[PDB]
Design a protein around this motif. Sequence first.
Motif, mmCIF file in Angstrom:
data_model
loop_
_atom_site.group_PDB
_atom_site.id
_atom_site.type_symbol
_atom_site.label_atom_id
_atom_site.label_comp_id
_atom_site.label_asym_id
_atom_site.label_seq_id
_atom_site.Cartn_x
_atom_site.Cartn_y
_atom_site.Cartn_z
ATOM 1 N N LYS A 174 0.912 -0.901 0.571
ATOM 2 C CA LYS A 174 0.294 -0.145 0.021
ATOM 3 C C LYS A 174 0.945 1.064 0.342
ATOM 4 C CE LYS A 174 -0.620 0.163 5.335
ATOM 5 N NZ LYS A 174 -0.883 0.220 6.567
ATOM 6 N N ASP A 175 2.607 1.784 0.483
ATOM 7 C CA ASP A 175 3.259 2.273 -0.079
ATOM 8 C C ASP A 175 3.331 3.323 -1.242
ATOM 9 O OD1 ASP A 175 5.201 3.747 1.073
ATOM 10 O OD2 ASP A 175 6.054 3.256 -0.689
ATOM 11 N N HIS A 176 2.004 3.953 -1.653
ATOM 12 C CA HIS A 176 2.019 4.664 -3.099
ATOM 13 C C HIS A 176 3.112 5.652 -2.820
ATOM 14 C CE1 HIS A 176 -1.502 2.480 -3.869
ATOM 15 N NE2 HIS A 176 -2.412 3.043 -2.171
ATOM 16 N N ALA A 177 3.424 6.097 -1.786
ATOM 17 C CA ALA A 177 4.648 7.053 -1.905
ATOM 18 C C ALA A 177 5.990 6.836 -2.954
ATOM 19 C CB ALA A 177 5.255 7.813 -1.236
ATOM 20 N N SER A 178 6.037 5.823 -3.046
ATOM 21 C CA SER A 178 7.052 4.372 -4.080
ATOM 22 C C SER A 178 7.272 4.722 -5.751
ATOM 23 C CB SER A 178 7.435 3.539 -3.720
ATOM 24 O OG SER A 178 6.813 2.556 -4.693
ATOM 25 N N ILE A 179 7.983 4.979 -6.080
ATOM 26 C CA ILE A 179 8.249 4.530 -7.969
ATOM 27 C C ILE A 179 9.563 4.153 -8.361
ATOM 28 C CG2 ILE A 179 10.204 6.863 -7.140
ATOM 29 C CD1 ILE A 179 6.811 6.528 -10.070
ATOM 30 N N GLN A 180 9.848 3.764 -9.246
ATOM 31 C CA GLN A 180 11.028 3.061 -9.935
ATOM 32 C C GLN A 180 10.581 4.216 -11.054
ATOM 33 O OE1 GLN A 180 8.967 -1.155 -11.174
ATOM 34 N NE2 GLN A 180 11.206 -1.324 -12.001
ATOM 35 N N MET A 181 11.974 4.876 -11.375
ATOM 36 C CA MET A 181 12.660 4.979 -12.369
ATOM 37 C C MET A 181 13.220 4.597 -13.093
ATOM 38 S SD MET A 181 12.394 8.596 -12.271
ATOM 39 C CE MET A 181 12.878 9.315 -14.053
ATOM 40 N N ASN A 182 12.815 5.229 -14.970
ATOM 41 C CA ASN A 182 13.845 4.259 -16.532
ATOM 42 C C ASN A 182 14.692 5.240 -16.694
ATOM 43 O OD1 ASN A 182 11.509 1.365 -15.355
ATOM 44 N ND2 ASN A 182 10.320 2.754 -15.990
ATOM 45 N N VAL A 183 15.730 4.644 -16.906
ATOM 46 C CA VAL A 183 16.247 5.870 -17.687
ATOM 47 C C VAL A 183 17.055 4.414 -18.239
ATOM 48 C CG1 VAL A 183 16.484 7.729 -15.597
ATOM 49 C CG2 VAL A 183 18.021 5.521 -15.741
ATOM 50 N N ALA A 184 16.779 4.935 -20.239
ATOM 51 C CA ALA A 184 18.149 4.053 -20.962
ATOM 52 C C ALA A 184 19.094 3.934 -21.067
ATOM 53 C CB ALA A 184 16.871 3.941 -21.811
ATOM 54 N N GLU A 185 19.390 3.231 -21.618
ATOM 55 C CA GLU A 185 21.261 3.523 -22.598
ATOM 56 C C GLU A 185 21.592 4.271 -23.605
ATOM 57 O OE1 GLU A 185 22.368 -0.349 -22.572
ATOM 58 O OE2 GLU A 185 22.118 -1.181 -20.829
ATOM 59 N N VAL A 186 22.642 4.362 -23.667
ATOM 60 C CA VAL A 186 23.350 5.383 -24.787
ATOM 61 C C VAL A 186 24.324 4.552 -25.534
ATOM 62 C CG1 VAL A 186 24.481 7.441 -24.866
ATOM 63 C CG2 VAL A 186 22.581 7.278 -23.560
ATOM 64 N N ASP A 187 24.677 4.857 -26.240
ATOM 65 C CA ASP A 187 24.943 4.128 -27.378
ATOM 66 C C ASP A 187 25.882 4.623 -28.081
ATOM 67 O OD1 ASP A 187 23.264 1.582 -28.041
ATOM 68 O OD2 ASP A 187 22.045 3.199 -29.968
ATOM 69 N N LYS A 188 27.240 4.828 -28.925
ATOM 70 C CA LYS A 188 28.397 4.969 -29.295
ATOM 71 C C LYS A 188 27.670 6.525 -29.773
ATOM 72 C CE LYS A 188 26.850 1.807 -32.672
ATOM 73 N NZ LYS A 188 26.461 0.886 -31.851
ATOM 74 N N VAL A 189 29.509 7.140 -30.365
ATOM 75 C CA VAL A 189 29.689 8.184 -31.213
ATOM 76 C C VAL A 189 28.012 8.876 -31.864
ATOM 77 C CG1 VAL A 189 31.060 10.002 -32.437
ATOM 78 C CG2 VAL A 189 32.113 7.725 -31.214
ATOM 79 N N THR A 190 27.395 7.398 -32.186
ATOM 80 C CA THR A 190 26.372 8.012 -33.416
ATOM 81 C C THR A 190 24.642 8.878 -31.672
ATOM 82 O OG1 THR A 190 25.461 5.974 -33.315
ATOM 83 C CG2 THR A 190 27.300 7.042 -34.896
ATOM 84 N N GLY A 191 25.305 8.075 -31.165
ATOM 85 C CA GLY A 191 24.249 9.092 -30.057
ATOM 86 C C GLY A 191 22.974 8.655 -30.482
ATOM 87 N N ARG A 192 22.398 6.922 -30.755
ATOM 88 C CA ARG A 192 21.112 6.080 -30.825
ATOM 89 C C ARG A 192 20.564 5.972 -29.995
ATOM 90 N NH1 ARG A 192 18.668 1.229 -32.109
ATOM 91 N NH2 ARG A 192 17.382 1.491 -33.588
ATOM 92 N N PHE A 193 19.332 5.700 -29.629
ATOM 93 C CA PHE A 193 18.863 5.760 -28.403
ATOM 94 C C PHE A 193 18.451 3.686 -28.433
ATOM 95 C CE2 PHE A 193 14.617 4.670 -26.317
ATOM 96 C CZ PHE A 193 14.940 5.149 -25.078
ATOM 97 N N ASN A 194 19.008 3.578 -27.461
ATOM 98 C CA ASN A 194 18.384 1.885 -27.121
ATOM 99 C C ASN A 194 17.094 2.053 -26.263
ATOM 100 O OD1 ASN A 194 20.576 0.774 -27.996
ATOM 101 N ND2 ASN A 194 22.032 1.122 -26.706
ATOM 102 N N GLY A 195 16.354 0.719 -26.766
ATOM 103 C CA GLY A 195 15.302 0.269 -25.544
ATOM 104 C C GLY A 195 15.636 -0.680 -24.719
#
Lengths: 222, 25, 129, 125, 97, 215, 81, 55
Positions: free
Chosen positions: G27-48
């Motif tokens: 019942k602890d509604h004050a919690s959160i699961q932050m989600n931050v994704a990884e970063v690729d190489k020099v091109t800078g492509r987004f990862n799933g």
Amino acid sequence: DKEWMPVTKLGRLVKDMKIKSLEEIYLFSLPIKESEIIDFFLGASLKDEVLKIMPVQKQTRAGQRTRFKAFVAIGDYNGHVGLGVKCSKEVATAIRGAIILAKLSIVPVRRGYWGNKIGKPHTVPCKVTGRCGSVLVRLIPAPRGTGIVSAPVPKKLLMMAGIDDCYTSARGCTATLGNFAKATFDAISKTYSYLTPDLWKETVFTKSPYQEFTDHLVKTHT
Amino acid sequence: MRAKWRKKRMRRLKRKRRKMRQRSK
Amino acid sequence: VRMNVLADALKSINNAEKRGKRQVLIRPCSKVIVRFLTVMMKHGYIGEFEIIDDHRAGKIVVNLTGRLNKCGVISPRFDVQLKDLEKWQNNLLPSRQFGFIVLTTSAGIMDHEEARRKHTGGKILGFFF
Amino acid sequence: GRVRTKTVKKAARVIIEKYYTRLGNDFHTNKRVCEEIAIIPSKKLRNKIAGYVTHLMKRIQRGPVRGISIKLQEEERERRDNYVPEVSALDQEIIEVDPDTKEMLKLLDFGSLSNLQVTQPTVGM
Amino acid sequence: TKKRRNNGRAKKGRGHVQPIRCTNCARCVPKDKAIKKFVIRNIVEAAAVRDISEASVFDAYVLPKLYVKLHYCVSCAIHSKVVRNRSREARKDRTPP
Amino acid sequence: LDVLQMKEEDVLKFLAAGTHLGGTNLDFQMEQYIYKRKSDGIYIINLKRTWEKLLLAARAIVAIENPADVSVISSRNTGQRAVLKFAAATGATPIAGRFTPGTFTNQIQAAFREPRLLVVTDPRADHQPLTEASYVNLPTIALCNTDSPLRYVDIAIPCNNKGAHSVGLMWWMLAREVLRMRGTISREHPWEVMPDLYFYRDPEEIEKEEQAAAE
Amino acid sequence: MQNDAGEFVDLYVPRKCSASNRIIGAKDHASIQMNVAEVDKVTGRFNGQFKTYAICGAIRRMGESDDSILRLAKADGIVSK
Amino acid sequence: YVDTAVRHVLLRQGVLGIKVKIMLPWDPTGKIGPKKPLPDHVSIVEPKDEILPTT
RNA sequence: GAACGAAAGUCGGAGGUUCGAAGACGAUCAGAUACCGUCGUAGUUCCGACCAUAAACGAUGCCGACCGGCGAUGCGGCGGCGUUAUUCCCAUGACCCGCCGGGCAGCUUCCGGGAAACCAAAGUCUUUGGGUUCCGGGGGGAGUAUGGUUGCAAAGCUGAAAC
Ligand SMILES: [Mg+2]
Ligand SMILES: [Mg+2]
Ligand SMILES: [Mg+2]
Ligand SMILES: [Mg+2]
Ligand SMILES: [Mg+2]
Ligand SMILES: [Mg+2]
Ligand SMILES: [Mg+2]
Ligand SMILES: [Mg+2]
Ligand SMILES: [Mg+2]
Ligand SMILES: [Mg+2]
Ligand SMILES: [Mg+2]
Ligand SMILES: [Mg+2]
Ligand SMILES: [Zn+2]
């Protein structure tokens, strides 16, 4: 024989049949709004009892106005109980409101052992406490086949909670159910909040059901 | 009746009974 | 003024656990406190700890984990015979499976579980779980 | 004495929310449009609702109104903004601010192009 | 229960404050509890300043100001309409405009 | 990293907007973000740890899967202009001004959403979504100053929320990094329009006066 | 929790917080699961591919989460040097 | 709109007054309720028009 | 066991401004000896002694540690080609900024307590133990009676039972 009227996106995942159990909802502590979600997940959790319907008053200009305050304890015997408080001007209206709010405020109950790891747990994992008002309720682990040694109202509550064996220790005004039952509710709700020496490892961190089935929610929202 | 004047009237009764004991030692 | 320095340590430990901090500043240093934290390390409730050796009396810094619900010192250090530890079991430990009691035995600072196998017994410092 | 009821204003807001292209700035036309797009029993209520509808039309046609916003008003809010002059996005290539950020641009590797000399007393607050 | 954290007056460090007499009902009240203000008036009411300015010997070279330490007590100050009552959230306020 | 580093045009834009200056009051959790005080009460906010939190906020926003699950809130008029052309640009859903408490708690009103990430402008002006975050279980990114509370806040970006140029530059460069992460704009490519949309417009007195002067 | 037979006895294993190592309640509604994704190489492509940072209720209410996310990702090496 | 009946009940304590008032529901077709709508109840229509613009 | 201990009260010496217990009248009041007014003793002043009491209050024992922030004040210490004062380097003066040590304090807060008011202590209390002193066990009877003890006395301290 009525449409569920889909809303709040969690029930829409349930009607899309993507969250298989209520255990997955309690893993992520998602808020519940409507009461028929746990009626969909649980078909035998209708075992309930009204505890006390006490009248409360409000002194108006000439005569006092009355409204009844209904307490309903619901629960399936596998370890999922709920408490519902509702004040209303009508008897059956207050009873239905307390049933719906108990369906909303259902919690799971952690079940432990006395010291032998046979199987089919029956007791609280440790000595826990619960405070509401001045009512301190302490739950102590018990051996196998001891029973519930308490007042009849939390005896019925722990009988619904699947705890076959427990010891109780209450201090304060035990005579008031609106504090005593809620203190017992806090004591049985702190059972998962207790830090235990068998959950040392970092969890798997499974994906959110929103991330897992975003597209069904998009095609039902648009 | 105030507690102050209850104490002072019991004090006056105490003085009266003390004078009664001095009157009949 | 200054007495029961193990209790003075565990009050700072308790307030740091209830606040949620990472590491604790503890101004006394006893070998009682060092062996107490050594038992807590061996059971794994706390982490690495560094004793800044001052010339007069050092300072212990304990890297906390987040595990400690409650730890304290029983005050007068009762003299406890065997076949009487079950009273402290039912009084201190929240369950049978969990928690430990620190028994100062005749062969060093030991544990509630270690004392029934060593068959020594002795005094009680406190408890931690 | 035009302090007409919340039910009158709310009915006129439902009218201006649902049907906007049917309404104009003329009272004698809007009163007749409201009797095709709604059911009002009272003729004084017809006149009151149609008058507040004309007042809402004079507000909406002149400026933006917070009370309701249809998709055409969202497109108008898109239309009102995109005329962007090029005057003060970036200044000329001389910017003087602070010796503290001069020390920041000396420590963290960047240009630190221009000179910086500004001294202020301690008469803050 | 407690109505005020300050318990009326401002005595926090010391233990005794000298009583100073009131003005209306003349009751000795400690000075951190009594309503102590400082009234600044003109010596003549403003509807009668113009008559003295017209019938004055000098050409507006004198303008006296009357300064009085006013010292009420809280038992008669509410009747004297200075220290009117407020709300529970309004007792936390400061110097009124 | 090595490509997410700031450049000379970026620090030209930041020093031209003047976001390095902040408030006069301190916070006990803004201590590692500030570097050095300055006379006349103004306190200097750095740029590196601001850019890192901007980068992580961009990572968290591109980490969403549904663009409807990101809500953008600002109540003050310096941010109300930026929200409408920010959220309707790439990936979010806007709301501005009067928040109407009950937006995310009760369900009798049709203005009800289920977001999975929240970016707000001012905590002191948007304390009510910070309060209602707990009942919805959403994270919170905020454009915080040195004198703002940090309750129910996950990602804080130290800045000046008073300067409209600073607010517009932050929203513009945030969307500018979000679009390059999503893949719409390449890394070596400038943006097509100068960001005054996100900054501010003074209404029709000096606007029409400058128009008539530029006729 | 397991028995002597070696079965998985517990109904659900709750999320331990990545900040204070405390079990988040149901019942602890004050919690959160932050989600931050990884970063690729020099091109800078987004990862799933993403990473989850759990922050609990008391940390979120006290405001320790702001420094906690950066001091947690500093051990990862994804926030800074 | 309201059917109102005031009646007496004679018991051993005396007379007892009863007042039953009932607000009738709106029935435009039938003898059950009144055909006239309420003056406060403003009835609007739904959005009617749809697709097929120019060509 | 002992030293101080507000105000009032008691025993000696000097006077007596003001106020003023009692007392005397003049007024209100059905009834006033009170609230309003006039006179005025003891007292209110100082020097010698006694009495040891209060809403003697922060209605919150003393010592020691920990557990948020902020703006301030006062007392010392430190830093600041900052500002202003002598005649002029030499030194304290005053303002301004920041830190440190204990203090009277204030605002907010979900850090927690508690029945709540409220409290950074009234927190670290069923997850119960830092040391130590004194007192409370329904309301009355009653802080009364009887004893012991101090005091010139008023009285003070200890202080029960029946019902
Ligand atoms: Mg009296
Ligand atoms: Mg009162
Ligand atoms: Mg005093
Ligand atoms: Mg009758
Ligand atoms: Mg005296
Ligand atoms: Mg004599
Ligand atoms: Mg006289
Ligand atoms: Mg008299
Ligand atoms: Mg005499
Ligand atoms: Mg006393
Ligand atoms: Mg004492
Ligand atoms: Mg000083
Ligand atoms: Zn007075």
